[PDB]
Paper text:
Here, we chose aminodeoxychorismate synthase (ADCS) from Escherichia coli, which consists of a class I glutaminase subunit (PabA) and a synthase subunit (PabB), to investigate the mechanism of glutaminase catalysis regulation and its impact on overall GAT activity. PabB catalyzes the amination of chorismate (Cho) to 4-amino-4-deoxy-chorismate, which is a committed step in folic acid biosynthesis. GATs comprise minimally a glutaminase that produces ammonia, which reacts with a synthase-bound substrate to yield specific nitrogen-containing products. As evidenced by analytical gel filtration and isothermal titration calorimetry (ITC) data, the PabA and PabB subunits form a heterodimeric assembly with a dissociation constant KD = 0.16 ± 0.06 μM.
When Cho was subsequently added to these crystals, it was bound to the synthase active site of both ADCS heterodimers. Consistent with previous observations for related MST enzymes, the benzoate moiety of Cho is complexed by a magnesium ion. The central part of the tunnel is mainly formed by hydrophobic PabB residues and terminates next to the 4-hydroxy-1,5-cyclohexadiene-1-carboxylic acid ring of Cho, which is the reactive group for Cho transamination. In contrast, upon additional Cho and Mg2+ binding to the ADCS synthase active site, there were no further significant alterations in the PabA/PabB arrangement, consistent with only a minor regulatory effect of Cho/Mg2+ on glutaminase activity. We also found several interactions between the noncatalytic amino group of Gln-TE and residues of both ADCS subunits, including bG207 and bY210 from the PabB subunit, allowing the catalytic center of Gln-TE to be positioned with very high spatial precision, to generate a catalytically competent glutaminase active site arrangement at the PabA/PabB interface. In this arrangement, the entire exposed Gln-TE surface not interacting with PabA residues (25 Å2) is buried by interactions with residues of the PabB subunit, demonstrating that the ADCS glutaminase active site is shared with the synthase subunit PabB.
Author numbering:
A (entry chain DDD): -1 to 453
B (entry chain AAA): 0 to 187
């Protein structure tokens, strides 16, 4: 019955900077335990780490079917998966007001895989489906643990007995597992020669006017043993990426070291921050300073970026309040441990009759990892990439009961399933792209991740 | 007040929607295979805009038929692919440019006519195109309104009817005076 609009009850825990990894350690083996981590990054959009587990409802989408699971009820539907997600959110009857210090007040959290985009556009079926992991794997949570690095506050919130949730958390124990070890070398799904053939086919499409940009990716695979959580602890420290995440799913684990925000909806203010443009970090600090200026002044990288800025204005423009779409920032350089990136910022407003779930449906998957025009680019990706992307170049994030949302692009993200680990790497092919430079750009983005796991 | 925007499966169409809505237009967006001519007659749009898109006018669904049927009946604006389609509809030819221009601005010179009424000359505009209208086969019913530095056609307008094309994107974040350009089509 009773709709709840009351703000959730909050217990403040001891401030420690490592609170999220500390508490998550005892949860990391549970299916539907999830961590969003800001990577301890010194970054304008690194503030929050969020921990959930023990969902009240789960949503699992494989192709045309979504399975909605709740304590004594399992339902299957062919309906639009984001429409079904919004229905499940509404039926929870938890409707708190926005709190700028608690941006997730319970709600939906999980994975929107790249192949969920097949529900939103009609796409060909050439690339092979060789990973069985859901297109959507989302929990509904009536509590959360929020770490706020700006206020130095750890908040445990619940809509249903926060003291009982605190005692549940204290009762969970971190009984550590064997360390992570790779048990094979990394191997790609394509040779240098195959990559070359595919690069040249993209350039034929650029010159024929089929497309203006296509993101072409390869995939590295290895076997592994030991605990995926231990791998993440090592990677998170080293990557300092503000949109990182660890998901324990029924089918395997997602280890995301993404530096990329897809879409934020914060009190109806929309933000998207497409990353397009890359150079490697150089070890000499004087040379590395010059490297940042080279990327900022690169004409090829500015074209690659601008095209995605106009595409994201379009994608947000499908739902934004008329006149609200703005570009406050073009071509800022952000340094990360492996690479310098060029990032731009687009803002807009969400209309009151729409939901963040409608904004996700209008924009998914990100133009920054497809290209332009997006439908044609996604057709070319399916034609040239030997396997479907699955979790990689999808999104992780939350849709709060208050209406807020935040999402990543799952670049720099590993999939750990059935003792196999997969790590993909791509880049935007445009008219001024060169074959060897684009091949090496894929390695520049993930070489440090691949090499850290070999030890 | 009612503008029908034909979407050629493009990733810039909704920038045109946003600019026309900001100007106070009511805008309906339909994909190029989601409508028949009969459907358009029942909707009774005041004007039609043909969006940008991938490939050539032959792959643009209903766009060529809409141009041929409503020519002289309702004002039509063609943007990039829409401009190419307008030239092709009256017997012009769409050919590869000397240099593709994708996410690059260019200064264009114009005659201050059609949608260039009141705009500064030259005008810096964003290009997203591999193809151009071949100048030799441009139908006699069209005046060239704008040129690139290498004398590529950047705009055309019909001598008799409200039927006008631009090769560039007025709605790009780096194009100059794109709201005013589209306002000319909306309010004239
Ligand atoms: C697909 C990737 O590349 C994407 C495109 C970039 C580029 O091409 O410069 C940079 C960031 C990413 O949005 C990747 O990170 O693996
Ligand atoms: N960096 C975000 C929170 C965040 C961390 N990892 C994420 C992954 C996906 C979405 C959001 C996040 C913030 O400070 O608010
Ligand atoms: N695809 C065409 C039209 C682009 C716009 O629209 C070209 O490359 O010229
Ligand atoms: Cl469907
Ligand atoms: Cl801190
Ligand atoms: Mg690049
Ligand atoms: Mg509603």
């Amino acid at each position: 019955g009773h709709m709840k609009t009351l703000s959730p009850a909050v217990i403040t825990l001891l401030w420690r900077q490592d609170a999220a990894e500390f508490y998550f350690s005892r949860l990391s083996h549970l299916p539907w335990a999830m961590l969003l981590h800001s990577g301890y990054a010194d970054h304008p959009y690194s503030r929050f780490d969020i921990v959930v587990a023990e969902p009240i409802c789960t949503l699992t989408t494989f192709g045309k079917e979504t399975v909605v699971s709740e304590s004594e009820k399992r339902t299957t539907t062919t309906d639009d998966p984001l429409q079904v997600l919004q229905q499940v959110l509404d039926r929870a009857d938890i409707r708190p007001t926005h709190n700028e210090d608690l941006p997730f007040q319970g709600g939906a959290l999980g994975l929107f895989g790249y192949d969920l985009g097949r529900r939103f556009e009609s796409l060909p079926e050439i690339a092979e489906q060789d990973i069985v992991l859901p297109d959507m794997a989302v929990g509904i949570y009536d509590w959360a643990l929020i770490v706020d690095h700006q206020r130095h506050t750890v908040s445990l919130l619940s809509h249903n007995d926060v003291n009982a949730r605190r005692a549940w958390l204290e009762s969970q124990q971190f009984s550590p597992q064997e360390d992570f070890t790779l048990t094979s070398d990394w191997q790609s799904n394509m040779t240098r020669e195959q990559y070359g053939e595919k690069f040249r086919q993209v350039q034929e499409y650029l010159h024929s006017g089929d497309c203006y940009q296509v993101n072409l990716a390869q995939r590295f695979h290895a076997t592994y043993s030991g605990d995926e959580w231990q791998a993440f602890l090592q990677l998170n420290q080293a990557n300092r990426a503000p949109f990182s995440a660890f998901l324990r799913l029924e089918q395997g684990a997602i280890l995301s070291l993404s530096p990329e925000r897809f879409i934020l909806c914060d009190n109806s203010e929309i933000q998207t921050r497409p990353i397009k443009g890359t150079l490697p970090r150089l070890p000499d600090p004087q040379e590395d300073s010059k490297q940042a200026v080279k990327l900022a002044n690169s004409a090829k990288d500015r074209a690659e970026n601008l095209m995605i800025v106009d595409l994201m204005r379009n994608d947000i423009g499908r739902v934004a309040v008329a006149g609200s779409v703005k570009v406050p920032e073009l071509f800022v350089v952000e340094p990360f441990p492996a690479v310098h990136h060029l990032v731009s910022t687009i803002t807009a407003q969400l209309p009151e009759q729409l939901h963040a779930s409608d904004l996700l449906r209008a924009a998914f998957p990100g133009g920054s990892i497809t290209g332009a025009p997006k439908v044609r680019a996604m057709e070319i990706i399916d034609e040239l990439e030997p396997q479907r992307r699955n979790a990689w170049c999808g999104s992780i994030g939350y849709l709060s009961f208050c209406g807020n949302m935040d999402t990543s692009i799952t670049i720099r993200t590993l999939t750990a399933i059935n003792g196999q680990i997969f790590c993909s790497a791509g880049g935007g092919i445009v008219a001024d792209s060169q074959e060897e430079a684009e091949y090496q750009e894929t390695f520049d983005k993930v070489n440090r991740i691949l090499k850290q796991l070999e030890k | 007040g009612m503008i029908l925007l034909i979407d050629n499966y493009d990733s810039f169409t909704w920038n045109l929607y946003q600019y026309f809505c900001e100007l106070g237009a009511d805008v309906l967006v339909k994909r190029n295979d989601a409508l028949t001519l009969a459907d358009i007659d029942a909707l009774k749009p005041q004007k039609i805009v043909i969006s940008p898109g991938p490939c050539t006018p032959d792959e643009a669904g209903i766009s060529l038929d809409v141009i041929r049927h409503y020519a002289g009946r309702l004002p039509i604006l063609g943007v990039c692919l829409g401009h190419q389609a307008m030239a092709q509809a009256f017997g012009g030819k769409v050919v590869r440019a000397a240099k593709v221009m994708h996410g690059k601005t260019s200064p264009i010179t114009h005659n201050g006519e059609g949608v260039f009424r009141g705009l500064a000359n030259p005008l810096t505009v964003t290009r997203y195109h591999s193809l151009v209208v071949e100048p030799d086969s441009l139908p006699a019913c069209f005046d060239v309104t704008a040129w690139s530095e290498t004398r590529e056609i950047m705009g055309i307008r019909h001598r008799q009817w409200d039927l006008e094309g631009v090769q560039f994107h007025p709605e790009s974040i780096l194009s100059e005076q794109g709201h005013q350009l589209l306002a000319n089509f909306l309010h004239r």
